[PDB]
RNA sequence: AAAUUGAAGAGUUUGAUCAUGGCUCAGAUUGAACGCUGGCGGCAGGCCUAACACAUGCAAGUCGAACGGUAACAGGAAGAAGCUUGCUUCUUUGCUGACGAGUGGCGGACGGGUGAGUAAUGUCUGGGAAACUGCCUGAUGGAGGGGGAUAACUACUGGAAACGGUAGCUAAUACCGCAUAACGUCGCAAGACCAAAGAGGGGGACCUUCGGGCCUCUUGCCAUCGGAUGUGCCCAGAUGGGAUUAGCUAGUAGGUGGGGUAACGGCUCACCUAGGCGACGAUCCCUAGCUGGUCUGAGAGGAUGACCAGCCACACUGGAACUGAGACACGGUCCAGACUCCUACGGGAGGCAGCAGUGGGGAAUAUUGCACAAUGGGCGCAAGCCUGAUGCAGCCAUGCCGCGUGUAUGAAGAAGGCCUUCGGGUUGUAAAGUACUUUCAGCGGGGAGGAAGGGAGUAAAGUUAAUACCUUUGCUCAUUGACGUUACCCGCAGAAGAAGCACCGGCUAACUCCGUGCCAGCAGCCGCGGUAAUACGGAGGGUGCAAGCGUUAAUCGGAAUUACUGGGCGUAAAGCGCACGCAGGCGGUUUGUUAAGUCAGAUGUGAAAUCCCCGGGCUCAACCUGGGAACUGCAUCUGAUACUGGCAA
RNA sequence: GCCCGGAUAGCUCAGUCGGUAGAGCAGGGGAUUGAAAAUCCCCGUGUCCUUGGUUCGAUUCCGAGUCCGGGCACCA
């Protein structure tokens, strides 16, 4: 089962999450097909915070890939008309 | 062992008791055809072939035998009946 | 981390005035300058080609208050950057906060400017900075916080900065202790004495 | 192998376990190692001041 | 290492003292089976008090074995000493941690040379209290002969500076109480009463900082190196910084469990024998004689001034003078060490039975402070007691 | 608009010289070790050796919405008995929630670890045909009716336990016929065939025989064909050293008859042919996980494969197969072994190269820690379990990076050391001081940010017979943090708590006095000492780095000292003693044609990471990260035909 | 934790059952040379592993230790 989920990169106490399309069995940090945007929880109100390429999501979710708890909410955060 | 999921040991042993009995049945019915083949015309061999056909197909569909195994045991065995007799 | 020894000993060995023991009075005439590095100061040095490079390197180090490990890192940065390797070495040294704090006049010496940076006094773009090595980017506004503003060490030290040449690249308000770093420093603006070419020779071999 | 006992005087005799580092002496033909003074049964040189990591002595 | 030791009933360090082959070790075996059967504690046997090849083919004891027997009032911890003339060094470690001894003189033989040598070591080291026990009795069926030995023990103790007549003398066979004789079972139950009545509650030092002399080092298969010994002062919590000071040099460490006769502890208090497990230390590098101190409290020294009181023939010691260069054994807390003597100016010779101060350079450094008590020995006998005056190193 | 901007020498053979040629040195780097010495933080990392043996504990379970259970637990409801009539005793009730003991459908095969083995059954790069696929998800079609058991649980014995019995009772999504089902197997076809399982939250209407018949909604079960993910198979080239290993091979090499495999095939038989391999190095021997990368280098190269990521292999040693979609299974079964264990001596165990830890090995690498809060994964409608996978912190100057240890004034140019041209200089603005600040730890008050949610009862809008349950978007709630006395922001005091250790004859930045006298010792190379040592030991004086510094080992560099770029062979090392000559390398000159080489474009692809530019967040950097090129690749169709080869005359 | 062996001038060894220890080989130390080797003339150059005891007197006899050698055990 393919799944869109965070990878957890960056330093100690200073995380940075590479949202990525990977297989269920493979590890968090490990194997994947293609990365699709990112997320930063320690960004705050500035120029950049979160980016998520919605065109590639249609290729995977449209076919048959689940979205994890955190990535499903970032699709709500980025919005359709807000 | 140091796990409470040793149920699979006793469940797999319980499976192969059944799984071997249905498998051994199948290969004796196939042996019944090979027994009929050698010294015999197209009559005794094809009677055995009609008996083993439902058993090999059924066992194939349960996940004991694969669908191609069954397919070969019809294909090559019909070729013994057709060519010789 | 720092030198913290006899500072005017460094000026006699090097020969020229390093602005280590600059302070309140303008000229020292209080060390037998040039002709007394140590016990054997009357000894005329033969001075090889590796000598003159290393004497030139240590002079630029002891003026700006940087150590070889950090100083080598500036050279590695300088080589990768565009333009001339020599001009970038010294342009990176002049962009330090403890050097800019000295050039603004908030400190009679550079060690006083280093301590004033370190002691939560210096603040730039509305953010306090402790690091003497802080790379001050173009178009900034260094300043002193309201608690430590107009303390007895800064007001006497700002009056010394009137006797100094005063850089063109940076500007000072002088009333409210507020500075403004504008552009990057040019070779021809400052020094006109410490050679860069010889320090590029020492690190390329 | 043979190892050189660098420094004035030593505590090595008969047995006594010692540590060995690399380095030829360049005088005794055959000898091509150095005893580490300080480590294990090989003690420091008595009454040294200048250069004491070499020859294994603490502060005065 | 499983059951947690509950801190109830005061702890007291007891041990058997006496002549060779005198029912000294066998008394300890009798005390277990008697107290275990009636009160209902842990059983144990006479075998576990001394096994090995050395205490079977021979029969004699070398190692100071330990036993834990409990009673309604207090929780005793036994220390079975060796007894022979060759084993005086490892005995003194067992005898120093002992608070109240149980002397062992026998009704057939009576007081014999080692009994005098043992009690001599008890005074100068630290043995406040002592209890007599006649460990044969049944072999000589007589009223007059058995009671004549009681008189000579009262003479011995009083002659050597103990109470003597005030000490409660008990009679009883150890082997008879081992099986199940109702009269002799009850007579060693009486000895447990005499331990409770005569010996008071001991005075500990749970205030001034941590110290623990190492009596015998172990290497537990799984945990690491364990050091045993009575905590002389202070406390030990689990996961606390501890410095090992004494012979060789000085090493940093941390405790990772304290125990009490194969039972866990949270706080190893003062005045009780505990096995401290140290972290990241080998069996060979840590040796017997060193002390577990709290960092900064004590420093190892190889030279010191000390007020040495030399003994005479009457008190028991040397009987001839000596000059600088003499090298006797100095017994501090546990171990002994040799050292050269340097006398003060204006003192030509040191006569026996005299109070003087002297500088003593030791070959090994040992952890020490001002006001530490030691007992000098040489030639299989005592020499002089004293106290430390000043540190030098 | 930026991605390569790219290359140093010196000493040392001689009386001196030029050459040859080794030796050594300056530079980088490192999983590092030692020695002296040590103060803090950011991110990293931290058994390279004995794939040695391992106590101890904890690392995979989970659904009651599969059923049996109306129970070993703990608690509501119809009713009961004591008596302080609601306080107590207490039988029934799926009936209170659940979940202990159970049988199934799934998980254990992933996640982790470690390189023993493997020089090609592996890996890498690029292709292919003969495959299979659980979970997820596309679309279709079901989802007819029966049976037989069996555990648990009594009972009764066996046995010390481990485990099995012996008579039963008893569900089911467990189990098995049956009728059917072609676009799904079988030959050309008429034919012959094979599959299943119900749960849970609600219900108006009418059957009530109350077990509720029956409608809904979800999840789940059906053969098929899918997509995705894979997983096996195959070929080509590449992927170490040795010829003082030159011959190797009989299921060996093919073909067919049979046989097996998910499937191609000596994978395995029976025969038939008697080959196949090898100087483009077979076979045998030694060594070795492989790659992305790392390191060094101007680049070619040389070295390398710790850390992150992919692939392979292995699981106490040696076998073996079972169960499944997937293993010949790391905490599965089974034998045999060795070595620890428990035994009532009949028989039982056991497998850290998962996390800590011990001994031992070693020059040398870490706590029997802390939490599921996040991020994955396992389970499940989800309320949450378990997760030593992740997260953290113990320890460790082991790294890369930051800030520390004060900051102005200071003449008597103090003393003491130290050289004395006993006049004086020198250490020296150094100290003592005389002014001011207080970073940093150390006390104390405030206090971000890792946190998205999860959950309740809700509105509407879907769903439908329905304003019920269910679902979605608005929508009101209360809360969740191991790290944690966080990061960070203000107040306390007073320089207060905080500097070495190399070196000093040349190379190579930096001098003297004593002591010693080819002795004692230094030594990376040359070389220092024989009574005036700049090299030894001491002292001062300096110089160079500094929280590190030296030494050590290890790789590249300099070494154009294996030279492809880029060397040589008269005399320095080096032309076989001289011929003939097969394989091999190279080949005059002119047209024609193929295009193998070569060249040009084409599409694929070189996993992501680092490496390199334009940016951004750590107070700054180190670190972190977004994009860009790069990834000098290797294959694939189309042309260009000069050159080289092929074939022409 | 305890049993055993080992130690003699700078190095390699003799000597003892209480009668006070020697040999070679190094080194000395003036001759000699810039300083050695050699030639020449004269030297043991000693805590008998350390320390105490039995005694008139201990290398020598008996304790106690030193560091090192090899041996057997204990698991809070
Ligand atoms: N008759 C009798 N004999 C005893 C008694 N106790 C001990 N024994 C004997 O002595 C031995 C016991 O050892 P003890 O000497 O008492 O104790 P120990 O600790 O071994 O003695 P040390 O050797 O001094 O340590 C046994 O072998 C008995 O034969 C007793 O009470 N009565
Ligand atoms: N305190 C310890 C005493 C001990 C020491 C050594 C062996 C046995 C016991 C207990 O156990
Ligand atoms: Mg946020
Ligand atoms: Mg927010
Ligand atoms: Mg999930
Ligand atoms: Mg088993
Ligand atoms: Mg059969
Ligand atoms: Mg199946
Ligand atoms: Mg099945
Ligand atoms: Mg630094
Ligand atoms: Mg020079
Ligand atoms: Mg900026
Ligand atoms: Mg370079
Ligand atoms: Mg020197
Ligand atoms: Mg005896
Ligand atoms: Mg005894
Ligand atoms: Mg260690
Ligand atoms: Mg461009
Ligand atoms: Mg010469
Ligand atoms: Mg030359
Ligand atoms: Mg490194
Ligand atoms: Mg260290
Ligand atoms: Mg410290
Ligand atoms: Mg710290
Ligand atoms: Mg650090
Ligand atoms: Mg490890
Ligand atoms: Mg390695
Ligand atoms: Mg794995
Ligand atoms: Mg990992
Ligand atoms: Mg790992
Ligand atoms: Mg690896
Ligand atoms: Mg393969
Ligand atoms: Mg491939
Ligand atoms: Mg199929
Ligand atoms: Mg599943
Ligand atoms: Mg029906
Ligand atoms: Mg039936
Ligand atoms: Mg029926
Ligand atoms: Mg039955
Ligand atoms: Mg049955
Ligand atoms: Mg039922
Ligand atoms: Mg039911
Ligand atoms: Mg079924
Ligand atoms: Mg039919
Ligand atoms: Mg029909
Ligand atoms: Mg068809
Ligand atoms: Mg077909
Ligand atoms: Mg029909
Ligand atoms: Mg059915
Ligand atoms: Mg497809
Ligand atoms: Mg390789
Ligand atoms: Mg033939
Ligand atoms: Mg380079
Ligand atoms: Mg090169
Ligand atoms: Mg590079
Ligand atoms: Mg590894
Ligand atoms: Mg890969
Ligand atoms: Mg393993
Ligand atoms: Mg296994
Ligand atoms: Mg195996
Ligand atoms: Mg396997
Ligand atoms: Mg497994
Ligand atoms: Mg296995
Ligand atoms: Mg078994
Ligand atoms: Mg076994
Ligand atoms: Mg295991
Ligand atoms: Mg481990
Ligand atoms: Mg193993
Ligand atoms: Mg260990
Ligand atoms: Mg710890
Ligand atoms: Mg936990
Ligand atoms: Mg908890
Ligand atoms: Mg907990
Ligand atoms: Mg947990
Ligand atoms: Mg929690
Ligand atoms: Mg989770
Ligand atoms: Mg999950
Ligand atoms: Mg689901
Ligand atoms: Mg629910
Ligand atoms: Mg939870
Ligand atoms: Mg668990
Ligand atoms: Mg845990
Ligand atoms: Mg902390
Ligand atoms: Mg690093
Ligand atoms: Mg390192
Ligand atoms: Mg100052
Ligand atoms: Mg000085
Ligand atoms: Mg100053
Ligand atoms: Mg001052
Ligand atoms: Mg001052
Ligand atoms: Mg103030
Ligand atoms: Mg801070
Ligand atoms: Mg607030
Ligand atoms: Mg939060
Ligand atoms: Mg969450
Ligand atoms: Mg919600
Ligand atoms: Mg909280
Ligand atoms: Mg909590
Ligand atoms: Mg912390
Ligand atoms: Mg705080
Ligand atoms: Mg704090
Ligand atoms: Mg205030
Ligand atoms: Mg204040
Ligand atoms: Mg030199
Ligand atoms: Mg020169
Ligand atoms: Mg020089
Ligand atoms: Mg002089
Ligand atoms: Mg030197
Ligand atoms: Mg002179
Ligand atoms: Mg001299
Ligand atoms: Mg100095
Ligand atoms: Mg360095
Ligand atoms: Mg080297
Ligand atoms: Mg080289
Ligand atoms: Mg080269
Ligand atoms: Mg060439
Ligand atoms: Mg050459
Ligand atoms: Mg020649
Ligand atoms: Mg020649
Ligand atoms: Mg010739
Ligand atoms: Mg010729
Ligand atoms: Mg040819
Ligand atoms: Mg041609
Ligand atoms: Mg042509
Ligand atoms: Mg033509
Ligand atoms: Mg053409
Ligand atoms: Mg392309
Ligand atoms: Mg493309
Ligand atoms: Mg591409
Ligand atoms: Mg790198
Ligand atoms: Mg990174
Ligand atoms: Mg950047
Ligand atoms: Mg900060
Ligand atoms: Mg990218
Ligand atoms: Mg990137
Ligand atoms: Mg990209
Ligand atoms: Mg672009
Ligand atoms: Mg792009
Ligand atoms: Mg890439
Ligand atoms: Mg064409
Ligand atoms: Mg043409
Ligand atoms: Mg040709
Ligand atoms: Mg040809
Ligand atoms: Mg002379
Ligand atoms: Mg003369």
Swiss-Prot record, chain A:
Keywords: Ribonucleoprotein, Ribosomal protein. InterPro entries: Ribosomal_bS16, Ribosomal_bS16_CS, Ribosomal_bS16_dom_sf. One of its GO terms (molecular function) is structural constituent of ribosome. It holds the Pfam family Ribosomal_S16. GO terms for biological process: translation. GO terms for cellular component: cytoplasm; small ribosomal subunit. Belongs to the bacterial ribosomal protein bS16 family. This is Small ribosomal subunit protein bS16.
Swiss-Prot record, chain C:
The keyword rRNA-binding applies. Keywords: Ribonucleoprotein, Ribosomal protein, RNA-binding, rRNA-binding. Residues 95-155 form the S4 RNA-binding domain. The keyword Ribosomal protein applies. GO terms for biological process: ribosomal small subunit biogenesis; translation. InterPro entries: Ribosomal_uS4 (IPR022801), Ribosomal_uS4_bac-type (IPR005709), Ribosomal_uS4_CS (IPR018079), Ribosomal_uS4_N (IPR001912), S4_RNA-bd (IPR002942), S4_RNA-bd_sf (IPR036986). GO terms for molecular function: rRNA binding; structural constituent of ribosome. GO terms for cellular component: small ribosomal subunit. PANTHER family: 30S 40S RIBOSOMAL PROTEIN, SMALL RIBOSOMAL SUBUNIT PROTEIN US4M. One of the primary rRNA binding proteins, it binds directly to 16S rRNA where it nucleates assembly of the body of the 30S subunit. With S5 and S12 plays an important role in translational accuracy. Part of the 30S ribosomal subunit. Contacts protein S5. The interaction surface between S4 and S5 is involved in control of translational fidelity. Belongs to the universal ribosomal protein uS4 family. This is Small ribosomal subunit protein uS4.
Curated annotation (Swiss-Prot), chain D:
With S4 and S5 plays an important role in translational accuracy. The modification 3-methylthioaspartic acid is found at residue 27. Disulfide bonds: none annotated. It comes from the Bacteria. Part of the 30S ribosomal subunit. Contacts proteins S8 and S17. May interact with IF1 in the 30S initiation complex. The modification N6-acetyllysine is found at residue 46. Belongs to the universal ribosomal protein uS12 family. The chain holds residues 63 to 122 of 124 of the full protein. This is Small ribosomal subunit protein uS12.
Curated annotation (Swiss-Prot), chain E:
Residues 173-175 are annotated as: G5. Its EC number is 3.6.5.3. GTP binds at residues 18-25, 80-84, 135-138. Residues 18-25 are annotated as: G1. Residues 59-63 are annotated as: G2. Transmembrane segments: none annotated. Belongs to the TRAFAC class translation factor GTPase superfamily. Classic translation factor GTPase family. EF-Tu/EF-1A subfamily. This is Elongation factor Tu 2. The gene is tuf2.
